[PDB]
RNA sequence: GGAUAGUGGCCUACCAUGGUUUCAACGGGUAACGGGGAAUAAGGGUUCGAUUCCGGAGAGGGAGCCUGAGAAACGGCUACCACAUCCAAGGAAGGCAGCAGGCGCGCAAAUUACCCAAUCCUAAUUCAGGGAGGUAGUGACAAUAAAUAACGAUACAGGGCCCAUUCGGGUCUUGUAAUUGGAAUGAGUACAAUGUAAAUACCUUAACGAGGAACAAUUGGAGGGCAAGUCUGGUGCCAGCAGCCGCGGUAAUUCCAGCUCCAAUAGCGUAUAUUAAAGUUGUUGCAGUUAAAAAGCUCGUAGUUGAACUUUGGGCCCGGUUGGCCG
């Protein structure tokens, strides 16, 4: 974006999650908006880290365009980022994959159906088959 | 005098003249401006007292 | 469930709704300040009533009472900061002397008109709502936006607007395309 | 002495006197006895649906002379029978036999409006459709 | 003494005859869960509080009880009652006042949707579960801001007034317009990005997106209260209007309409409840000769109220305050 000059404020370091976190703002005059990739690459190069090691979120474009503010989170390693970020944000960043859990209603149906069966039910399957044949 | 039928006498007997087409009046602040010129600067409504809807005398 | 989100009304419709004197007076304000409804007049009068009620409470309070000083200082400070009051009339009784026209005069409509950006107050409102005005450097399109006593130095055309040096609008751009096509 | 007890410990006498005199106040007595709940045809409700039993013409009180158009209607929720004015020109034609109508008050709380003798309610919706909507033709009666 | 985890007529046994009440016991009604609070008020107050917080009580009624630390648990069992489901007719299985949803009831109240991303909770627990909760949908219950058009020139017609070579063009007109121009935009679509658990919206912004027939703002009203019509046509005490007074009986400022106007305006009306107005509930603050109201008169218990009098004044300092003596 034209004249991003991304600024970072309140850059407090947390060794607890081993990262540097700051309130980030981006000035994008004459351009609609800036995206996750373009934000992360610039933040990565200025903080001396890989593109994945830095995380940004919460970008609200302020009225009239011109600039937006989000939250930036640069980790001390890719492994640190992988352990600490939520899976939704990782798949948001493209590093991870969307977990294939079924819908809540189908998932809950499975729970209540298997709740009616005590134990493995392998013997029950054989018995039901024998009676159905009978 | 006296009727339970014929209810709706004049309502059905009126010769219905449809509304005449006319330029739509402005809405909102535009209408308030229209009123302001109508009742303050177009003082041409006074016959001695500031009438608002004089009859076509 | 969640804690309740509080809210309140900002205006008070008048008792005796049809005093011809009040109706004429409020229409004069509406015409000369480019207001859309009587709701704006009611809101400003409700606001003035609230400030006058607080100022009356504190003015009958004993002199150099801690509550009087603290509350009165805060009241006058925000008044002068918004500019409705004036620094020459710094004392508290002048708040009682205030009138609804004073707040209306400091509305964004009339300040745009007074700064000369507007042809009139109604032209001013159209200009504000169409995101062509800006305070500080940011587009503001609430006509009722109160201007502090320091932001008159920043009210001017929005950088995103065609009147602020931006792209030549939409209908002019369309008409320019039509002219080029007709000459093509 | 002004007739009422002035003494400082006489609050009880003043309270019971006020209680004994509150009962002469018309709306307060109605509220406490629950007459609106007990005896009023709507049972305190602002509106009530009913079936029109029959149409009626009611001659107006003096000095007026005319025949206001009303309907004897039996409420759904009580079974009580009520006369209701059909408040517009020719709307008695819209109200047929055996329709379900909505009834509202006349504004004069529990009383009769103007020249209409004894009719304390007015019809609002006919067969679920609005009277003034029918009267200005903004809606059509389903006729079913 | 039992019993209780524990006090206790909580229960048992013997005994005494006590306990509450006109300072309203007891009984009845409540269209009564209590409170923090809500509406509306000069002050006093009046009414409301099922409902987001706290505390109670219930899982259709009622009782009984297992486990556990904690249950009279009901999304746990037992029985009866009332419902109601499937049977292959012997049996079996249930409590939505959880979340959606259906019927009934009514004037009166939404989707059988997405998710654990928050806020928190629970488990053996960083990982799982959570219709708790959040998101979206429905949603004019309420509250916030605020589009429905601005600007120029001529035509139209006067007022300040350069000069009054008037009062001409009318210099600046200010308004009136079937005069005409360019300029701005959003509502809505829409690549995209952000937004999100994923989205939808919001916020941003390429492309598109005003000139009326358009992208059209209604709801009530025009006799008084209460500003707005002595205008026109129709009806002729009929139809109808009208909160009240009243309008209408062939000249309707009130009905049905047209036009014009007025009020509030994405809101406006209507019905009911309630408050101020209401000093028509009157403690502050009513009234009682005649308007409603002084018991027929006296006695009298409860209640309310009830004569004066008991240490005063004067001297002696200290130390705080408004200060002004004094800058």
PDB file of N, CA, C and O (backbone and C1' of nucleotides) in Angstrom, chain C residues 2 4 7-8 10 18 26 36-39 43 120 123 125 130 132 142 144 167 169-172 174-175, chain E residues 52 142-151 183-185 205-210 226-227 264-266:
ATOM      1  N   UNK C   2     -26.409 -11.221  29.945  1.00  0.00           N
ATOM      2  CA  UNK C   2     -25.465 -10.117  29.929  1.00  0.00           C
ATOM      3  C   UNK C   2     -25.935  -8.977  30.827  1.00  0.00           C
ATOM      4  O   UNK C   2     -27.119  -8.844  31.143  1.00  0.00           O
ATOM      5  N   UNK C   4     -27.034  -5.207  31.444  1.00  0.00           N
ATOM      6  CA  UNK C   4     -27.877  -4.412  30.549  1.00  0.00           C
ATOM      7  C   UNK C   4     -27.119  -3.236  29.959  1.00  0.00           C
ATOM      8  O   UNK C   4     -26.383  -2.533  30.654  1.00  0.00           O
ATOM      9  N   UNK C   7     -29.221   3.121  28.197  1.00  0.00           N
ATOM     10  CA  UNK C   7     -29.493   4.136  27.193  1.00  0.00           C
ATOM     11  C   UNK C   7     -30.495   5.125  27.765  1.00  0.00           C
ATOM     12  O   UNK C   7     -31.140   4.863  28.783  1.00  0.00           O
ATOM     13  N   UNK C   8     -30.606   6.273  27.108  1.00  0.00           N
ATOM     14  CA  UNK C   8     -31.498   7.323  27.570  1.00  0.00           C
ATOM     15  C   UNK C   8     -31.914   8.171  26.382  1.00  0.00           C
ATOM     16  O   UNK C   8     -31.335   8.086  25.299  1.00  0.00           O
ATOM     17  N   UNK C  10     -32.578  11.911  24.570  1.00  0.00           N
ATOM     18  CA  UNK C  10     -31.834  13.159  24.519  1.00  0.00           C
ATOM     19  C   UNK C  10     -32.714  14.384  24.316  1.00  0.00           C
ATOM     20  O   UNK C  10     -32.184  15.479  24.116  1.00  0.00           O
ATOM     21  N   UNK C  18     -48.820  23.464  21.365  1.00  0.00           N
ATOM     22  CA  UNK C  18     -49.300  24.337  20.295  1.00  0.00           C
ATOM     23  C   UNK C  18     -49.358  25.789  20.738  1.00  0.00           C
ATOM     24  O   UNK C  18     -50.335  26.492  20.489  1.00  0.00           O
ATOM     25  N   UNK C  26     -39.427  28.587  17.111  1.00  0.00           N
ATOM     26  CA  UNK C  26     -38.615  27.418  16.796  1.00  0.00           C
ATOM     27  C   UNK C  26     -38.481  27.207  15.293  1.00  0.00           C
ATOM     28  O   UNK C  26     -37.471  26.664  14.837  1.00  0.00           O
ATOM     29  N   UNK C  36     -33.453  19.856  10.380  1.00  0.00           N
ATOM     30  CA  UNK C  36     -34.382  19.012   9.638  1.00  0.00           C
ATOM     31  C   UNK C  36     -35.725  18.851  10.337  1.00  0.00           C
ATOM     32  O   UNK C  36     -36.771  18.893   9.684  1.00  0.00           O
ATOM     33  N   UNK C  37     -35.723  18.671  11.650  1.00  0.00           N
ATOM     34  CA  UNK C  37     -36.943  18.453  12.404  1.00  0.00           C
ATOM     35  C   UNK C  37     -36.974  19.394  13.592  1.00  0.00           C
ATOM     36  O   UNK C  37     -36.017  20.119  13.865  1.00  0.00           O
ATOM     37  N   UNK C  38     -38.096  19.380  14.304  1.00  0.00           N
ATOM     38  CA  UNK C  38     -38.119  20.029  15.602  1.00  0.00           C
ATOM     39  C   UNK C  38     -37.383  19.212  16.645  1.00  0.00           C
ATOM     40  O   UNK C  38     -37.117  19.720  17.738  1.00  0.00           O
ATOM     41  N   UNK C  39     -37.036  17.967  16.317  1.00  0.00           N
ATOM     42  CA  UNK C  39     -36.308  17.122  17.251  1.00  0.00           C
ATOM     43  C   UNK C  39     -34.967  17.738  17.604  1.00  0.00           C
ATOM     44  O   UNK C  39     -34.539  17.690  18.761  1.00  0.00           O
ATOM     45  N   UNK C  43     -33.747  18.646  21.259  1.00  0.00           N
ATOM     46  CA  UNK C  43     -32.519  18.109  21.824  1.00  0.00           C
ATOM     47  C   UNK C  43     -31.641  19.219  22.374  1.00  0.00           C
ATOM     48  O   UNK C  43     -31.119  19.115  23.488  1.00  0.00           O
ATOM     49  N   UNK C 120     -24.652  28.163   1.755  1.00  0.00           N
ATOM     50  CA  UNK C 120     -25.659  28.470   2.762  1.00  0.00           C
ATOM     51  C   UNK C 120     -25.651  27.340   3.782  1.00  0.00           C
ATOM     52  O   UNK C 120     -24.827  26.423   3.705  1.00  0.00           O
ATOM     53  N   UNK C 123     -26.894  24.177   1.931  1.00  0.00           N
ATOM     54  CA  UNK C 123     -25.741  23.708   1.176  1.00  0.00           C
ATOM     55  C   UNK C 123     -24.691  23.132   2.110  1.00  0.00           C
ATOM     56  O   UNK C 123     -24.005  22.164   1.764  1.00  0.00           O
ATOM     57  N   UNK C 125     -25.231  21.528   5.016  1.00  0.00           N
ATOM     58  CA  UNK C 125     -25.622  20.193   5.462  1.00  0.00           C
ATOM     59  C   UNK C 125     -25.407  19.155   4.377  1.00  0.00           C
ATOM     60  O   UNK C 125     -24.939  18.047   4.656  1.00  0.00           O
ATOM     61  N   UNK C 130     -22.437  14.356   2.765  1.00  0.00           N
ATOM     62  CA  UNK C 130     -21.841  13.678   1.626  1.00  0.00           C
ATOM     63  C   UNK C 130     -20.344  13.465   1.791  1.00  0.00           C
ATOM     64  O   UNK C 130     -19.645  13.240   0.797  1.00  0.00           O
ATOM     65  N   UNK C 132     -17.777  15.361   2.481  1.00  0.00           N
ATOM     66  CA  UNK C 132     -16.884  16.304   1.832  1.00  0.00           C
ATOM     67  C   UNK C 132     -16.216  17.245   2.813  1.00  0.00           C
ATOM     68  O   UNK C 132     -15.276  17.946   2.430  1.00  0.00           O
ATOM     69  N   UNK C 142     -21.511  13.782  10.572  1.00  0.00           N
ATOM     70  CA  UNK C 142     -22.614  14.081  11.479  1.00  0.00           C
ATOM     71  C   UNK C 142     -22.773  15.598  11.503  1.00  0.00           C
ATOM     72  O   UNK C 142     -21.863  16.295  11.976  1.00  0.00           O
ATOM     73  N   UNK C 144     -24.478  17.414  13.401  1.00  0.00           N
ATOM     74  CA  UNK C 144     -24.555  17.932  14.756  1.00  0.00           C
ATOM     75  C   UNK C 144     -23.227  17.875  15.482  1.00  0.00           C
ATOM     76  O   UNK C 144     -23.158  18.304  16.637  1.00  0.00           O
ATOM     77  N   UNK C 167      -9.989  12.351  -6.411  1.00  0.00           N
ATOM     78  CA  UNK C 167     -10.445  11.930  -7.723  1.00  0.00           C
ATOM     79  C   UNK C 167     -11.658  12.750  -8.158  1.00  0.00           C
ATOM     80  O   UNK C 167     -12.497  13.109  -7.325  1.00  0.00           O
ATOM     81  N   UNK C 169     -14.704  12.937  -8.665  1.00  0.00           N
ATOM     82  CA  UNK C 169     -16.075  12.539  -8.422  1.00  0.00           C
ATOM     83  C   UNK C 169     -16.581  11.420  -9.319  1.00  0.00           C
ATOM     84  O   UNK C 169     -15.819  10.677  -9.939  1.00  0.00           O
ATOM     85  N   UNK C 170     -17.906  11.317  -9.385  1.00  0.00           N
ATOM     86  CA  UNK C 170     -18.578  10.268 -10.139  1.00  0.00           C
ATOM     87  C   UNK C 170     -19.334  10.790 -11.349  1.00  0.00           C
ATOM     88  O   UNK C 170     -19.119  10.305 -12.463  1.00  0.00           O
ATOM     89  N   UNK C 171     -20.227  11.764 -11.169  1.00  0.00           N
ATOM     90  CA  UNK C 171     -21.003  12.246 -12.305  1.00  0.00           C
ATOM     91  C   UNK C 171     -20.123  13.043 -13.259  1.00  0.00           C
ATOM     92  O   UNK C 171     -20.291  12.968 -14.481  1.00  0.00           O
ATOM     93  N   UNK C 172     -19.179  13.823 -12.729  1.00  0.00           N
ATOM     94  CA  UNK C 172     -18.239  14.508 -13.607  1.00  0.00           C
ATOM     95  C   UNK C 172     -17.393  13.501 -14.366  1.00  0.00           C
ATOM     96  O   UNK C 172     -17.116  13.679 -15.557  1.00  0.00           O
ATOM     97  N   UNK C 174     -18.281  10.392 -15.099  1.00  0.00           N
ATOM     98  CA  UNK C 174     -19.162   9.788 -16.091  1.00  0.00           C
ATOM     99  C   UNK C 174     -19.389  10.724 -17.267  1.00  0.00           C
ATOM    100  O   UNK C 174     -19.354  10.299 -18.425  1.00  0.00           O
ATOM    101  N   UNK C 175     -19.623  12.005 -16.986  1.00  0.00           N
ATOM    102  CA  UNK C 175     -19.833  12.974 -18.054  1.00  0.00           C
ATOM    103  C   UNK C 175     -18.565  13.180 -18.870  1.00  0.00           C
ATOM    104  O   UNK C 175     -18.632  13.390 -20.086  1.00  0.00           O
TER     105      UNK C 175
ATOM    106  P     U E  52     -34.050 -10.746  36.347  1.00  0.00           P
ATOM    107  O5'   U E  52     -32.928 -10.497  35.255  1.00  0.00           O
ATOM    108  C5'   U E  52     -32.491 -11.559  34.416  1.00  0.00           C
ATOM    109  C4'   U E  52     -31.112 -11.300  33.868  1.00  0.00           C
ATOM    110  C3'   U E  52     -30.197 -10.486  34.776  1.00  0.00           C
ATOM    111  O3'   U E  52     -28.860 -10.950  34.645  1.00  0.00           O
ATOM    112  C1'   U E  52     -30.485  -9.361  32.721  1.00  0.00           C
ATOM    113  P     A E 142     -41.670   0.873  20.148  1.00  0.00           P
ATOM    114  O5'   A E 142     -41.368   1.440  21.603  1.00  0.00           O
ATOM    115  C5'   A E 142     -40.298   2.337  21.818  1.00  0.00           C
ATOM    116  C4'   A E 142     -39.474   1.970  23.026  1.00  0.00           C
ATOM    117  C3'   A E 142     -38.240   2.832  23.212  1.00  0.00           C
ATOM    118  O3'   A E 142     -38.532   4.045  23.863  1.00  0.00           O
ATOM    119  C1'   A E 142     -37.622   0.580  23.361  1.00  0.00           C
ATOM    120  P     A E 143     -38.358   5.413  23.060  1.00  0.00           P
ATOM    121  O5'   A E 143     -37.002   5.975  23.655  1.00  0.00           O
ATOM    122  C5'   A E 143     -35.976   6.413  22.794  1.00  0.00           C
ATOM    123  C4'   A E 143     -34.619   6.037  23.315  1.00  0.00           C
ATOM    124  C3'   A E 143     -33.474   6.533  22.462  1.00  0.00           C
ATOM    125  O3'   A E 143     -33.161   7.883  22.709  1.00  0.00           O
ATOM    126  C1'   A E 143     -33.157   4.266  22.887  1.00  0.00           C
ATOM    127  P     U E 144     -33.122   8.903  21.482  1.00  0.00           P
ATOM    128  O5'   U E 144     -31.706   8.627  20.821  1.00  0.00           O
ATOM    129  C5'   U E 144     -30.537   8.585  21.617  1.00  0.00           C
ATOM    130  C4'   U E 144     -29.312   8.424  20.764  1.00  0.00           C
ATOM    131  C3'   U E 144     -29.345   9.154  19.436  1.00  0.00           C
ATOM    132  O3'   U E 144     -29.037  10.525  19.564  1.00  0.00           O
ATOM    133  C1'   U E 144     -28.570   6.959  19.104  1.00  0.00           C
ATOM    134  P     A E 145     -29.795  11.610  18.664  1.00  0.00           P
ATOM    135  O5'   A E 145     -28.903  11.677  17.359  1.00  0.00           O
ATOM    136  C5'   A E 145     -27.500  11.828  17.461  1.00  0.00           C
ATOM    137  C4'   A E 145     -26.825  11.314  16.224  1.00  0.00           C
ATOM    138  C3'   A E 145     -27.399  11.829  14.920  1.00  0.00           C
ATOM    139  O3'   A E 145     -26.892  13.101  14.567  1.00  0.00           O
ATOM    140  C1'   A E 145     -27.181   9.492  14.803  1.00  0.00           C
ATOM    141  P     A E 146     -27.835  14.160  13.821  1.00  0.00           P
ATOM    142  O5'   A E 146     -28.197  13.445  12.453  1.00  0.00           O
ATOM    143  C5'   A E 146     -27.184  13.122  11.517  1.00  0.00           C
ATOM    144  C4'   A E 146     -27.730  12.220  10.453  1.00  0.00           C
ATOM    145  C3'   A E 146     -28.836  12.834   9.620  1.00  0.00           C
ATOM    146  O3'   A E 146     -28.318  13.596   8.549  1.00  0.00           O
ATOM    147  C1'   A E 146     -29.534  10.728  10.416  1.00  0.00           C
ATOM    148  P     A E 147     -29.305  14.329   7.528  1.00  0.00           P
ATOM    149  O5'   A E 147     -29.634  13.203   6.459  1.00  0.00           O
ATOM    150  C5'   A E 147     -30.372  13.517   5.296  1.00  0.00           C
ATOM    151  C4'   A E 147     -30.053  12.579   4.168  1.00  0.00           C
ATOM    152  C3'   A E 147     -30.933  12.732   2.946  1.00  0.00           C
ATOM    153  O3'   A E 147     -30.504  13.788   2.112  1.00  0.00           O
ATOM    154  C1'   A E 147     -30.802  10.455   3.526  1.00  0.00           C
ATOM    155  P     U E 148     -31.420  15.088   1.924  1.00  0.00           P
ATOM    156  O5'   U E 148     -32.700  14.523   1.173  1.00  0.00           O
ATOM    157  C5'   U E 148     -32.560  13.850  -0.066  1.00  0.00           C
ATOM    158  C4'   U E 148     -33.815  13.104  -0.419  1.00  0.00           C
ATOM    159  C3'   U E 148     -35.079  13.942  -0.466  1.00  0.00           C
ATOM    160  O3'   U E 148     -35.235  14.560  -1.733  1.00  0.00           O
ATOM    161  C1'   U E 148     -35.459  11.943   0.766  1.00  0.00           C
ATOM    162  P     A E 149     -36.129  15.878  -1.911  1.00  0.00           P
ATOM    163  O5'   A E 149     -35.070  17.062  -1.911  1.00  0.00           O
ATOM    164  C5'   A E 149     -34.412  17.430  -0.714  1.00  0.00           C
ATOM    165  C4'   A E 149     -32.941  17.646  -0.938  1.00  0.00           C
ATOM    166  C3'   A E 149     -32.558  18.910  -1.681  1.00  0.00           C
ATOM    167  O3'   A E 149     -32.540  20.034  -0.827  1.00  0.00           O
ATOM    168  C1'   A E 149     -31.344  17.078  -2.545  1.00  0.00           C
ATOM    169  P     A E 150     -32.636  21.513  -1.428  1.00  0.00           P
ATOM    170  O5'   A E 150     -31.120  21.880  -1.722  1.00  0.00           O
ATOM    171  C5'   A E 150     -30.185  21.982  -0.663  1.00  0.00           C
ATOM    172  C4'   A E 150     -28.781  22.114  -1.190  1.00  0.00           C
ATOM    173  C3'   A E 150     -28.524  23.304  -2.093  1.00  0.00           C
ATOM    174  O3'   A E 150     -28.282  24.490  -1.362  1.00  0.00           O
ATOM    175  C1'   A E 150     -27.574  21.354  -3.039  1.00  0.00           C
ATOM    176  P     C E 151     -28.647  25.917  -1.992  1.00  0.00           P
ATOM    177  O5'   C E 151     -27.676  26.048  -3.249  1.00  0.00           O
ATOM    178  C5'   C E 151     -26.272  26.149  -3.070  1.00  0.00           C
ATOM    179  C4'   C E 151     -25.537  26.237  -4.381  1.00  0.00           C
ATOM    180  C3'   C E 151     -26.078  27.242  -5.373  1.00  0.00           C
ATOM    181  O3'   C E 151     -25.694  28.566  -5.074  1.00  0.00           O
ATOM    182  C1'   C E 151     -25.574  25.223  -6.485  1.00  0.00           C
ATOM    183  P     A E 183     -19.784  17.627 -14.836  1.00  0.00           P
ATOM    184  O5'   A E 183     -19.837  17.842 -13.260  1.00  0.00           O
ATOM    185  C5'   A E 183     -18.967  18.781 -12.651  1.00  0.00           C
ATOM    186  C4'   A E 183     -19.353  19.092 -11.225  1.00  0.00           C
ATOM    187  C3'   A E 183     -19.553  17.922 -10.279  1.00  0.00           C
ATOM    188  O3'   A E 183     -18.331  17.374  -9.817  1.00  0.00           O
ATOM    189  C1'   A E 183     -21.263  19.514  -9.954  1.00  0.00           C
ATOM    190  P     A E 184     -18.268  15.872  -9.252  1.00  0.00           P
ATOM    191  O5'   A E 184     -19.160  15.916  -7.939  1.00  0.00           O
ATOM    192  C5'   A E 184     -18.682  16.538  -6.761  1.00  0.00           C
ATOM    193  C4'   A E 184     -19.543  16.186  -5.580  1.00  0.00           C
ATOM    194  C3'   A E 184     -19.878  14.714  -5.424  1.00  0.00           C
ATOM    195  O3'   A E 184     -18.850  13.926  -4.858  1.00  0.00           O
ATOM    196  C1'   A E 184     -21.845  15.958  -5.205  1.00  0.00           C
ATOM    197  P     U E 185     -18.819  12.353  -5.180  1.00  0.00           P
ATOM    198  O5'   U E 185     -19.999  11.768  -4.293  1.00  0.00           O
ATOM    199  C5'   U E 185     -20.018  11.980  -2.894  1.00  0.00           C
ATOM    200  C4'   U E 185     -21.406  11.829  -2.328  1.00  0.00           C
ATOM    201  C3'   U E 185     -21.953  10.419  -2.303  1.00  0.00           C
ATOM    202  O3'   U E 185     -21.437   9.660  -1.228  1.00  0.00           O
ATOM    203  C1'   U E 185     -23.614  11.897  -3.095  1.00  0.00           C
ATOM    204  P     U E 205     -13.364   5.135   1.756  1.00  0.00           P
ATOM    205  O5'   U E 205     -13.117   4.154   0.534  1.00  0.00           O
ATOM    206  C5'   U E 205     -11.821   4.012  -0.017  1.00  0.00           C
ATOM    207  C4'   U E 205     -11.800   2.966  -1.097  1.00  0.00           C
ATOM    208  C3'   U E 205     -12.795   3.156  -2.221  1.00  0.00           C
ATOM    209  O3'   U E 205     -12.363   4.114  -3.166  1.00  0.00           O
ATOM    210  C1'   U E 205     -12.846   0.915  -1.504  1.00  0.00           C
ATOM    211  P     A E 206     -13.130   4.271  -4.564  1.00  0.00           P
ATOM    212  O5'   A E 206     -12.417   3.192  -5.488  1.00  0.00           O
ATOM    213  C5'   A E 206     -12.920   2.898  -6.774  1.00  0.00           C
ATOM    214  C4'   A E 206     -12.052   1.901  -7.489  1.00  0.00           C
ATOM    215  C3'   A E 206     -12.606   1.408  -8.813  1.00  0.00           C
ATOM    216  O3'   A E 206     -12.334   2.292  -9.883  1.00  0.00           O
ATOM    217  C1'   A E 206     -11.979  -0.443  -7.511  1.00  0.00           C
ATOM    218  P     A E 207     -13.518   3.163 -10.525  1.00  0.00           P
ATOM    219  O5'   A E 207     -14.522   2.072 -11.092  1.00  0.00           O
ATOM    220  C5'   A E 207     -14.115   1.195 -12.127  1.00  0.00           C
ATOM    221  C4'   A E 207     -15.259   0.337 -12.587  1.00  0.00           C
ATOM    222  C3'   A E 207     -16.614   1.020 -12.584  1.00  0.00           C
ATOM    223  O3'   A E 207     -16.839   1.798 -13.744  1.00  0.00           O
ATOM    224  C1'   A E 207     -16.791  -1.049 -11.485  1.00  0.00           C
ATOM    225  P     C E 208     -17.712   3.138 -13.646  1.00  0.00           P
ATOM    226  O5'   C E 208     -19.170   2.608 -13.295  1.00  0.00           O
ATOM    227  C5'   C E 208     -19.870   1.793 -14.218  1.00  0.00           C
ATOM    228  C4'   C E 208     -21.110   1.182 -13.616  1.00  0.00           C
ATOM    229  C3'   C E 208     -22.173   2.137 -13.113  1.00  0.00           C
ATOM    230  O3'   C E 208     -22.931   2.731 -14.146  1.00  0.00           O
ATOM    231  C1'   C E 208     -21.905   0.366 -11.578  1.00  0.00           C
ATOM    232  P     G E 209     -23.500   4.216 -13.953  1.00  0.00           P
ATOM    233  O5'   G E 209     -24.353   4.131 -12.613  1.00  0.00           O
ATOM    234  C5'   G E 209     -25.620   3.494 -12.602  1.00  0.00           C
ATOM    235  C4'   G E 209     -26.210   3.465 -11.218  1.00  0.00           C
ATOM    236  C3'   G E 209     -26.463   4.817 -10.580  1.00  0.00           C
ATOM    237  O3'   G E 209     -27.663   5.411 -11.027  1.00  0.00           O
ATOM    238  C1'   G E 209     -25.392   3.412  -9.028  1.00  0.00           C
ATOM    239  P     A E 210     -27.608   6.741 -11.916  1.00  0.00           P
ATOM    240  O5'   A E 210     -27.845   7.917 -10.877  1.00  0.00           O
ATOM    241  C5'   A E 210     -28.169   9.223 -11.332  1.00  0.00           C
ATOM    242  C4'   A E 210     -29.639   9.499 -11.178  1.00  0.00           C
ATOM    243  C3'   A E 210     -30.080  10.899 -11.580  1.00  0.00           C
ATOM    244  O3'   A E 210     -31.390  10.835 -12.142  1.00  0.00           O
ATOM    245  C1'   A E 210     -30.549  10.548  -9.286  1.00  0.00           C
ATOM    246  P     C E 226     -54.968  25.137  24.538  1.00  0.00           P
ATOM    247  O5'   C E 226     -54.778  24.774  23.008  1.00  0.00           O
ATOM    248  C5'   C E 226     -53.752  25.387  22.245  1.00  0.00           C
ATOM    249  C4'   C E 226     -54.039  25.289  20.773  1.00  0.00           C
ATOM    250  C3'   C E 226     -55.314  25.983  20.324  1.00  0.00           C
ATOM    251  O3'   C E 226     -55.137  26.464  19.000  1.00  0.00           O
ATOM    252  C1'   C E 226     -55.469  23.682  19.850  1.00  0.00           C
ATOM    253  P     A E 227     -54.503  27.913  18.766  1.00  0.00           P
ATOM    254  O5'   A E 227     -53.161  27.602  17.984  1.00  0.00           O
ATOM    255  C5'   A E 227     -52.294  28.657  17.607  1.00  0.00           C
ATOM    256  C4'   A E 227     -52.249  28.817  16.112  1.00  0.00           C
ATOM    257  C3'   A E 227     -53.612  28.818  15.426  1.00  0.00           C
ATOM    258  O3'   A E 227     -53.721  29.806  14.389  1.00  0.00           O
ATOM    259  C1'   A E 227     -52.279  27.027  14.596  1.00  0.00           C
ATOM    260  P     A E 264     -44.093  20.866  14.907  1.00  0.00           P
ATOM    261  O5'   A E 264     -43.846  19.304  15.022  1.00  0.00           O
ATOM    262  C5'   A E 264     -44.092  18.632  16.243  1.00  0.00           C
ATOM    263  C4'   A E 264     -44.115  17.144  16.047  1.00  0.00           C
ATOM    264  C3'   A E 264     -43.041  16.579  15.143  1.00  0.00           C
ATOM    265  O3'   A E 264     -41.773  16.469  15.751  1.00  0.00           O
ATOM    266  C1'   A E 264     -45.100  15.644  14.547  1.00  0.00           C
ATOM    267  P     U E 265     -40.459  16.649  14.851  1.00  0.00           P
ATOM    268  O5'   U E 265     -40.595  15.508  13.754  1.00  0.00           O
ATOM    269  C5'   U E 265     -40.436  14.149  14.116  1.00  0.00           C
ATOM    270  C4'   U E 265     -40.771  13.220  12.980  1.00  0.00           C
ATOM    271  C3'   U E 265     -39.776  13.175  11.841  1.00  0.00           C
ATOM    272  O3'   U E 265     -38.645  12.382  12.139  1.00  0.00           O
ATOM    273  C1'   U E 265     -41.969  13.264  10.977  1.00  0.00           C
ATOM    274  P     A E 266     -37.400  12.361  11.133  1.00  0.00           P
ATOM    275  O5'   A E 266     -37.600  11.027  10.292  1.00  0.00           O
ATOM    276  C5'   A E 266     -37.000   9.809  10.712  1.00  0.00           C
ATOM    277  C4'   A E 266     -38.035   8.814  11.157  1.00  0.00           C
ATOM    278  C3'   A E 266     -37.520   7.399  11.404  1.00  0.00           C
ATOM    279  O3'   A E 266     -38.272   6.805  12.460  1.00  0.00           O
ATOM    280  C1'   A E 266     -39.201   7.352   9.761  1.00  0.00           C
TER     281        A E 266
END
